[PDB]
Amino acid sequence: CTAITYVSKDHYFGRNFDYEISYNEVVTITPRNYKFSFREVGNLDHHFAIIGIAAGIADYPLYYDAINEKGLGMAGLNFSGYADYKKIEEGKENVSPFEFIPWVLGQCSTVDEAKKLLKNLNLVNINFSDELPLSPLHWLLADKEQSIVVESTKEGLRVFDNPVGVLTNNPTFDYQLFNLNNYRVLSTRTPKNNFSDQIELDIYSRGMGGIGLPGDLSSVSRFVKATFTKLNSVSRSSEYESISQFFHILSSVEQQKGLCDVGDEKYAYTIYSSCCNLEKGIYYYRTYDNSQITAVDMNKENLEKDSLIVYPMVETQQINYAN
Amino acid sequence: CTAITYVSKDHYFGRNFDYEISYNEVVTITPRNYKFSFREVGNLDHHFAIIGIAAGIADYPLYYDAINEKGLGMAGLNFSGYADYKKIEEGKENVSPFEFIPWVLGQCSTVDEAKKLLKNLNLVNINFSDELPLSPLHWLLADKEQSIVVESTKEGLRVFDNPVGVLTNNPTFDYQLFNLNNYRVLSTRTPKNNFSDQIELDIYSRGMGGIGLPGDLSSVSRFVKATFTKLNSVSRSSEYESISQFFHILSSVEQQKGLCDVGDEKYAYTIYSSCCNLEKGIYYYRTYDNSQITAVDMNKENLEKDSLIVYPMVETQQINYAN
Amino acid sequence: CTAITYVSKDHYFGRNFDYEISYNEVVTITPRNYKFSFREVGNLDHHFAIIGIAAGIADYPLYYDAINEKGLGMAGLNFSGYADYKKIEEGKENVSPFEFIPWVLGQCSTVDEAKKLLKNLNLVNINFSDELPLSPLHWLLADKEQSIVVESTKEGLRVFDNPVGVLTNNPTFDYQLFNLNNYRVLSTRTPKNNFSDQIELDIYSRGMGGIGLPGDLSSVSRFVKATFTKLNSVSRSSEYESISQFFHILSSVEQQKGLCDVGDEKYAYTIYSSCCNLEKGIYYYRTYDNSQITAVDMNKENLEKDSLIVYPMVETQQINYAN
Amino acid sequence: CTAITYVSKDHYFGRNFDYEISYNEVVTITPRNYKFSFREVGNLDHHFAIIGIAAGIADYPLYYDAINEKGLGMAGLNFSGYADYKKIEEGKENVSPFEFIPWVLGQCSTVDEAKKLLKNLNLVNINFSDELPLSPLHWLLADKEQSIVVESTKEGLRVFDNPVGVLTNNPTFDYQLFNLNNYRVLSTRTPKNNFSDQIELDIYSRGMGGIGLPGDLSSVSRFVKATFTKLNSVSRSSEYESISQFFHILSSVEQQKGLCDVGDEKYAYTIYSSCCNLEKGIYYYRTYDNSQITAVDMNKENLEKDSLIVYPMVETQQINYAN
């Protein structure tokens, strides 16, 4: 998985969901008066509306990622072997990983607001159900001002500022930023010949600025490539051009089927790619086998309802036969 | 640019068109009785029908790439500094680069037929017009059996068998092939710890078998990653699944605006990406700002006509507003 | 700087000293009755004998690295921007970094003995003199059983077990070990063609198993190359063949004059390379401009002396003229 | 193998010889009246004196490399699968590769005379004996002005100007030179942060300008590292500092025992490193097991004699015991 933010005119949030098997992913709009019950903290009976993609195997919205009506987005990504969830701790706000996105997005308008709520957080090892045990995750949260990473590990809980607005998988976010130092030389422009002024070296290609940028599908490589591609993307003139650019950023680190064998010829691939406009509350998406962008507008729903609004995902190729 | 062939059940041919300014790219079908006049060789009043994308110019189909009704595909890719076109040479079939796609596709049903035709070729330095001078190019040709590469350089004209079915830009195809030798260790599977049996190294990420795959936008790196992506790709035989995978291959090496500055913030990008089904004579494309796949099927035209049939490209996002 | 341990039959400890200026380096034997007066802990009037290279600018052994008569080694290596030395701390053994090698090598026979001593350590910010401010360092220690790394950073004092017997410069040892994870595929053997079984790739060179191994003079690169070369070294068990292999390992990551510009054409270079036989108390060294190995044997001295025994370093080429 | 030239007042020529077995290497001086009989060309009864290292497996001087008394150097380096020797061709000068160093060095004082002598060369597939079959080789020749590469391949005989003064093993020299274009950005100085101006990247280590330089033992990687290390080396004009720098260039790309397994745990290693002063006729060398530089001065012999003068190689460490 790779989550990013991107600023064009509006502000965007979204991610590649990379895995070897799809359950029943659905787009779910959680309206304001859908009651959020939490196992160990106060229930939010009235809360901010939420749109995200979720696992369609429960009556509760099990969001992989989501934005709320106030322009704050949040995404969980695999953090296998690194995630550690705790026992209940008296004095702390005890929240399960499965409840975590509803907990933040339900009551925070901004990243700064989330940073305060996170001050007494303790992420507790409580499964949604016996059938559906907790996944190991870390989180990126973002609004139009900034983003942060939330990592609960053996050492404890850390909340980092994200100066690049990108997150992938392992390892800890401090290592991911540090590894960027190794790439200071990369550029969008043709480099000078610094190798030696004794020989003429020929600029035989465009794009030599970037040689060194890694192209594999590992978590660190994808973080570096995604970061370089996002930081150096142009902004665009319209909504349609902007989400174009955004999906180009996500394509840069997507996982094509056949390339990432995780087991007995079992293939991890980008099952969906999401792009969310934080100002407009629109959840755009593509899937592996539908390249057309689909838009689900949370503001077209009645956000005062008390029941989830659940749309299946458009999964088959949607082709424009033009002649 | 990057051009590839791919086989699922059918055989597919297509390219990324990578340049810093879009002109008037249009899908153009050349029917069988559109007379081809050649400046220095014998005319073809009747020939195979062709579909491809061209520069949108009334008087002649100036193709960047195309396929014919017999399942032969051909594309010109940039080859700046390496391309060399020749004086008229007596006893040769003297053919300009701008005429080269119509010359081969017009009378060749297979790559083998192209091989025999190319024995007598001399590519000559004649512009289409004073306003429209030749580009430096080389060519990938392909059918359901094989692909070849054609390079006219200062040393002369070579025809290479292309065992990987991929072409990008500079240098010569022999170097490009050789360089793959350096990537023998890349894998779709997790590598063993060969580094030392005295220490334990942790598999902290998925996709570590690809580490060392270049991810930059230069010509050689794009060649390596397209090749690795194409050769290790998997897909169902169904059409939608197959073109989906093909477009993911092209996505793996596309150029995002902002990342390749070719001189004072003029950015090279993947203006369009094509995929052609050689068996069904269908030209599918995406554009930088339209992610939906568009199909133009040469068989729905009247291929006995003698005028160009030109379609504007669908260039803005065609989005499914699903709610 | 790079420091390594190595086992053949005997156990060896040594380092490359990589810097832009020489501080009158000398081989110094500190005999047993040379009184150590520490600024904040108790004096050691009788201690283990020590042999190392030191800065010959005081009648005090200002060691860069050394071993003692009981086969324990210690080396200080640049750690600039990461090292943090502390205020005097109550209930701790407050040792200055300039006293640190004497403190440990004077009273410990083994790494395990050093580990106990290190539990109570606080490295204090006390300069040898107003004319010689403290250097930012971190330390490798080693005996015939194991090696450890000591880092005093802003977060505090950490002692690591060192599973590879190598250390370089920045960053912290945890990153350095984690980064090895990236090189799991490197091999001493020709790799299989894993890229694709659809194509034949030629083994055009010996040594292809190592492709990916970094060759630059940076701290992480040098850590990776010294680790791979050390762990994959072979040699027979004789003294000369063992130390030969050891200097070959150090040679792999030495810094050639001209290649590392630290400033205004100021060149950091490997001023010396050391190899110490822990069992025999022999300090072997080469220098940039003397490729011959020189040996100083601690045990040929009167170790009951009370004054430093100082040998000049042979720093001009000692050539065998065969005719 | 790696062969280099280097200039620092005097002009130096030299090589690493890398193989997994020894053929009793000796320094051999061939005096002016030692008769060279050639199978297919005219004998040299009188010729220039030569010094070099040879396989001590026959009474004929089977030089791996050598220099003559006139300042011209020539070395044979492994070129396995690339070298191709021919049948005798009427109207050529037909020379076996075993004859080639005596043929050239016997009678040329400069690289230009070598160029003229080479114009009609045909390297013929004729063994020294039934017992010693030819080795597949290419050559570096150098004098104080320039160096050249000679490659007889399946496609023919080519002579290249060598603008870097470096040669290794496979592939052809034109690819080796072309590949340097890929490393145009490497620098001896710390690069700026081109990655992005939006974030701060720290210079946590010295030598970061070199990051990307390959450090493995393969033919292309050593060519690239030897080239960067030679071209950026800072020259001291005195003899000992000059040969000292030279031997550090060759150490940069030496092959350590255990790291290059050529099959069945048989290990390729730098058996010797040579540095020849062309002006003075001195053959300086080190071996894998002797770090001290040994020097053989051709001009101290009676070069008017007619028999070979052999200096067996020193193959124990020559340790300077200082106490």
Cα C267 from Cα C209, distance rounded (Å): 32
CA distances from D166 to C55, D116, D139, D161 (A): 38, 22, 11, 11
- For helices C173-180 and A173-180, angle between their N-to-C axes, nearest 10 degrees: 80
Query: To the nearest whole angstrom, how far is the Cα of A58 from the nearest Cα of chain D?
Result: 42
- Sign for the CA dihedral angle at C203, C206, C207, C209 comes to positive
R_g of chain B, CA atoms, integer Å = 20
- Asked if C249 and B249 count as a contact pair (C-beta separation under 8 A), the reply is no
- Sign for the CA dihedral angle at D207, D208, D211, D216 comes to positive
Residue with tokens 């709610």: B323
Query: Nearest by CB to B206, which of A207, A245, A260?
Result: A260
- How many CA atoms lie within 13 Å of D106's alpha carbon, on the beta-carbon side? 21
Token pair, residue D237, equals 């004009």
Query: To the nearest whole angstrom, how far is the Cα of D180 from the nearest Cα of chain C?
Result: 15
Taking the CA atoms of residue D293, residue D298, residue D301 and residue D307 in that order, the dihedral angle to the nearest 10 degrees is: 110
Q: What are phi and psi of A102, to 5 degrees?
A: -55, -40
Cβ-Cβ contacts under 8 Å, C199 against chain B = 163-164, 180, 231
Give yes or no for a cis peptide into D171 (omega within 30° of 0). yes
- Asked if C297 and C48 count as a contact pair (C-beta separation under 8 A), the reply is no
3-state helix, strand, coil in chain D (%, to 5): 20, 35, 50
Burial class (CB in 10 A: 0-12, 13-18, 19+), D148: buried
Q: Is A96 left (phi over 0), alpha (psi -120 to 50) or beta?
A: beta
Among this protein's residues, is B1 annotated catalytic? yes
CA distances from C296 to A225, C49, C270, C293, C316 (A): 52, 14, 20, 10, 17
CA distances from A296 to A60, A62, A280, A281, A300 (A): 19, 18, 11, 9, 8
Element (DSSP H or E) covering residue B64:
strand B63-68
Cα A88 from Cα A94, distance rounded (Å): 6
Cα B257 from Cα B265, distance rounded (Å): 10
- Sign for the CA dihedral angle at C23, C24, C28, C30 comes to negative
Q: A217 vs B234: CB contact, 8 Å cut-off?
A: no
Cβ-Cβ contacts under 8 Å, A185 against chain D = 185, 191-192, 194-195, 208-209, 211-212
So where are chain C's domains?
Answer: 1-313
Token pair, residue B140, equals 């990938």
Q: Which of C283, C281, C303 is nearest to C293 (CA)?
A: C283
* DSSP per residue, A264-288: SS-B-EEEEEEEEETTTTEEEEEET
Tell me, what amino acid is at A204? Y
How far apart, in Å, do the first and last CA atoms of chain C sit? 38
Chain centre distance of CA D319: 27
- For helices D219-231 and D173-180, angle between their N-to-C axes, nearest 10 degrees: 60
- Asked if D76 and D134 count as a contact pair (C-beta separation under 8 A), the reply is no
Enter the resolution in angstroms. 2.1
Cα D167 from Cα D183, distance rounded (Å): 17
Q: Which of A54, A118, A41, A7 is nearest to A285 (CA)?
A: A54
- For helices D100-107 and D111-118, angle between their N-to-C axes, nearest 10 degrees: 130
Q: B216 vs A210: CB contact, 8 Å cut-off?
A: yes
Q: Tell me which DSSP letter residue C29 carries.
A: E
Q: Tell me which DSSP letter residue C112 carries.
A: H
Cβ-Cβ contacts under 8 Å, B224 against chain A = 215
Cα C51 from Cα C49, distance rounded (Å): 7
Cβ-Cβ contacts under 8 Å, D171 against chain B = 178
Query: To the nearest whole angstrom, how far is the Cα of B221 from the nearest Cα of chain A?
Result: 8
Query: Nearest by CB to D180, which of A182, A192, A201?
Result: A201
CA distances from C313 to A274, C3, C64, C295, D32 (A): 66, 20, 14, 10, 43
Residues contacting residue D42 through CB under 8 Å, at least 6 positions apart = none
Q: What are phi and psi of D271, to 5 degrees?
A: -65, -45
Residues contacting residue B279 through CB under 8 Å, at least 6 positions apart = B10, B11, B71, B144
Residue of D nearest to A196 (CA): D231
Token pair, residue A213, equals 């940028």
Burial class (CB in 10 A: 0-12, 13-18, 19+), B139: buried
- Asked if C246 and C12 count as a contact pair (C-beta separation under 8 A), the reply is yes
Q: Which of B155, B149, B157 is nearest to B124 (CA)?
A: B157
Query: Which strand ranges, in their side-by-side order, compose the sheet holding D156-161?
Result: D156-161, D147-153, D137-142, D73-78, D62-68, D50-55, D25-30, D309-312
* DSSP per residue, A42-56: --BSS---EEEEEES
- Asked if D122 and D95 count as a contact pair (C-beta separation under 8 A), the reply is yes
Q: Is B258 left (phi over 0), alpha (psi -120 to 50) or beta?
A: left
Q: A314 vs B320: CB contact, 8 Å cut-off?
A: yes
Cα C281 from Cα C51, distance rounded (Å): 8
Cβ-Cβ contacts under 8 Å, C318 against chain D = 292, 320
Cα C231 from Cα C7, distance rounded (Å): 10
Q: A81 vs B204: CB contact, 8 Å cut-off?
A: yes
Give yes or no for a cis peptide into B171 (omega within 30° of 0). yes
What CATH code is assigned to A1-313? 3.60.60.10
Coil, helix or strand at residue C76:
strand
Q: Which of A295, A310, A315 is nearest to A61 (CA)?
A: A310
Query: Nearest by CB to B221, which of A215, A267, A291?
Result: A215
Residues contacting residue B238 through CB under 8 Å, at least 6 positions apart = none
Q: What are phi and psi of A137, to 5 degrees?
A: -135, 165
Q: Tell me which DSSP letter residue D280 carries.
A: T
Q: What are phi and psi of B132, to 5 degrees?
A: -135, 70
Residue with tokens 């081809």: B36
Cα A35 from Cα B293, distance rounded (Å): 41
Q: D196 vs A163: CB contact, 8 Å cut-off?
A: no
CA distances from B194 to A275, C202, C232 (A): 40, 21, 10
* DSSP per residue, C158-226: EEEE-SSSEE-SSS-HHHHHHHHGGGTT--SSPPP--S-TTS-----SS-GGGTT-B-SSSHHHHHHHH
**How many C-beta atoms surround the C-beta of residue A246 within 10 A?**
26
Token pair, residue C205, equals 């060179």
Cα C224 from Cα D160, distance rounded (Å): 36
Cα C74 from Cα C102, distance rounded (Å): 10
- Asked if B166 and B249 count as a contact pair (C-beta separation under 8 A), the reply is no
Neighbours of chain B (3+ CB pairs under 8 A): A, C, D
Cα A158 from Cα B259, distance rounded (Å): 33
Q: Which of C263, C299, C288, C238 is nearest to C12 (CA)?
A: C238
Cα C217 from Cα D235, distance rounded (Å): 19
**Taking CB atoms and an 8 Å cut-off, how many pairs form between chains C and D?**
250
Residue of B nearest to D170 (CA): B178
Residues contacting residue D275 through CB under 8 Å, at least 6 positions apart = D12, D13, D14, D243, D246, D247, D250, D284, D285, D293
Q: B178 vs D182: CB contact, 8 Å cut-off?
A: no
Cβ-Cβ contacts under 8 Å, C178 against chain A = 171, 175
CA distances from C167 to A240, B214, C11, C220, C227 (A): 52, 29, 17, 10, 9
Q: What are phi and psi of A80, to 5 degrees?
A: -65, 130
Q: Which of residues 144-163 of C touch D (CB under 8 A)?
A: none
Q: Does B283 contact chain A (CB < 8 Å)? A: no
Q: Does D171 contact chain B (CB < 8 Å)? A: yes
Q: D204 vs A211: CB contact, 8 Å cut-off?
A: no
Q: A184 vs D191: CB contact, 8 Å cut-off?
A: yes
Q: B171 vs D182: CB contact, 8 Å cut-off?
A: no
Cα C48 from Cα C59, distance rounded (Å): 18
- How many CA atoms lie within 13 Å of B32's alpha carbon, on the beta-carbon side? 9
Residue of D nearest to A177 (CA): D201
Q: C231 vs B195: CB contact, 8 Å cut-off?
A: yes
**How many C-beta atoms surround the C-beta of residue C302 within 10 A?**
10
Query: To the nearest whole angstrom, how far is the Cα of B40 from the nearest Cα of chain A?
Result: 32
Cβ-Cβ contacts under 8 Å, A268 against chain B = 206-207
Q: Does C242 contact chain D (CB < 8 Å)? A: no
- For helices A239-251 and A219-231, angle between their N-to-C axes, nearest 10 degrees: 150
Residue with tokens 């100083």: C296
Query: To the nearest whole angstrom, how far is the Cα of C113 from the nearest Cα of chain B?
Result: 25
Tell me, what amino acid is at C199? I
Query: To the nearest whole angstrom, how far is the Cα of B157 from the nearest Cα of chain D?
Result: 16
Token pair, residue B31, equals 């029917």
Q: What is the largest CA-CA distance in chain A?
A: 74
Cα B28 from Cα B49, distance rounded (Å): 11
Q: Which of A188, A186, A193 is nearest to D186 (CA)?
A: A193
**How many C-beta atoms surround the C-beta of residue D90 within 10 A?**
6
Q: Which of residues 193-232 of C touch D (CB under 8 A)?
A: 202, 204-221, 225, 228-229, 232
Q: Which approach determined this entry?
A: X-ray
Residue of C nearest to D217 (CA): C207
Query: To the nearest whole angstrom, how far is the Cα of B185 from the nearest Cα of chain C?
Result: 5
Cα A315 from Cα B233, distance rounded (Å): 20
- Asked if B67 and B108 count as a contact pair (C-beta separation under 8 A), the reply is no
